[PDB]
Curated annotation (Swiss-Prot), chain A:
Phylogenetic lineage: Eukaryota, Metazoa, Chordata, Craniata, Vertebrata
Consequence of changing residue 63 to H: In ESTRR; results in highly reduced activity
Post-translational note: Phosphorylated by cyclin A/CDK2 and CK1. Phosphorylation probably enhances transcriptional activity. Self-association induces phosphorylation. Phosphorylated by LMTK3 in vitro. Glycosylated; contains N-acetylglucosamine, probably O-linked.
Tissue: Widely expressed. Not expressed in the pituitary gland.
Phenotype for residue 82 to H: In ESTRR; highly decreased estrogen receptor activity
Name of the protein described by the UniProt record: Estrogen receptor
Organism this protein belongs to: Homo sapiens (Human)
Superkingdom per UniProt: Eukaryota
Length: 227, 234
């Protein structure tokens, strides 16, 4: 796979080039606007995912499983990235900057978790090159432990995913070493960034929990991938 | 004193703190009903929770926190901690979850409860991943401690900012310990950081299993804040 031959800078360059644009809110019903926004973001997310090195080496069934498990975490981590420069606020779009008081509409509990994630990123001085690495880890990791098959192909697919995840780890480390971090600082920061992904999983599970609907089904994702 | 520990002293402290393995209620009526299986598992978990507080109080740095923050971390982490212990106990039993030495269950037995074959399958996949990574006991105790300190830290004045900093400093210390363990084992630098990432990434899966375990549940057996607090003071 081409992905496994990439250097750290080529991997970063590929991911930076795949970044979807920042969409605007069309306009009210909170769910209304957020739903309209997320629906337009998902279309760009499928095209982004097709451009993550290694992803299209997988079967369509496995690409859908990964997206089904990761899509809300991917939307949330984009939101948190957008919001770093707005302490106390969530920048859903450039024309939809919501503060905490506008979550009281069980939405506040998740707003708070999202704000805490944005704060953490700010604290850490999270860089854009690191963000795109983290977003692609979410895509490949979130669903990998729940492939439901035991065929040779499934084993080969999971093994490919883990080698791409290793490549992204190497990339994260190279970015930090090139920024001047000591060997120990490199390990510590890699771990800090990966541990935040556990909180993003938690937030996504909450959001799903309170929802239960408007979730993209397996069949919906398969068709968007086929097009 | 916790941040002054060497990597070597950290592993020795975590290994010494480690809780006993408990038995399920002896000679339960078999085959199980959904209610009787949930009864056995709840009784096992309730007894394990007592020893989890004892272990937690011995995790370097945990007891430097206020009691409130200690309870908050245990409330957030308790089921994840129980599940990683289950996954570890079960590594040497493919196809099977060793809930206790006298309670080894195969996948068909997870079907007795509604929706708990799904989780049951998720736990089996984790034990297989640990088996295939050949996870070592010293790594397991570091990972269980990371879960305790990490799961609740992002859901907490200067005092609060200092508590979090202390937690992130202890987490760094446990990270350095994991790396130290992999270096002494002979892993290249590249292999060290890749293995660290692989282990930390499995923790997001454990979070997912704990979340689903709760959701299925809700579809009073959870330990209360007051209960956790009472056990921490005694
Ligand atoms: C579809 O299933 C859902 C699961 C959880 C929720 N929640 C409640 S939530 O609080 O977790 C979720 C997080 C944020 O608020 C919510 C929302 C959203 C996402 C998709 C939608 O269709 C509608 C709203 C958000 C969002 C939108 C765009 C972003 O770019 C980022 C974040 C809603 C729906
Ligand atoms: C109180 O919250 C709950 C959250 C999730 C669940 N689940 C299914 C519904 S479950 O399958 O996720 C959960 C995981 C495993 O099976 C269950 C169970 C358990 C834990 C505490 C209890 O009170 C009762 C049962 C387990 C366990 C027990 C001891 C261990 O040492 C390790 C694991 C049940 C209760």
């Amino acid at each position: 796979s081409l992905a496994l031959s990439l250097t750290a800078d080529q991997m970063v360059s590929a991911l930076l080039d795949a970044e979807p644009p920042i969409l605007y809110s069309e306009y009210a019903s909170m769910m209304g606007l957020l739903t309209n926004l997320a629906d337009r973001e998902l279309v760009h997310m499928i095209n982004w995912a097709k451009r993550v090195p290694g992803f299209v080496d997988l079967t369509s069934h496995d690409q859908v499983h990964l997206l089904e498990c990761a899509w809300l975490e991917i939307l949330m981590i984009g939101l948190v990235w957008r919001s770093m420069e707005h302490p106390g606020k969530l920048l859903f779009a450039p024309n939809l900057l919501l503060d905490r008081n506008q979550g009281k509409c069980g939405m506040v509990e998740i707003f708070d978790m999202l704000l805490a994630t944005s704060s953490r990123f700010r604290m850490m001085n999270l860089q854009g090159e690191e963000f795109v690495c983290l977003k692609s880890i979410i895509l490949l990791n979130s669903g990998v432990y729940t492939f439901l098959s035991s065929t040779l192909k499934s084993l080969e697919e999971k093994d490919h995913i883990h080698r791409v995840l290793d490549k992204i780890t190497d990339t994260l480390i190279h970015l930090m070493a090139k920024a001047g971090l000591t060997l120990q600082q490199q390990h510590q920061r890699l771990a800090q960034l990966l541990l935040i992904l556990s909180h993003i999983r938690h937030m996504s599970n909450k959001g799903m929990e309170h929802l239960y609907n408007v979730v993209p089904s397996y069949d919906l994702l398969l068709e968007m991938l086929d097009a």
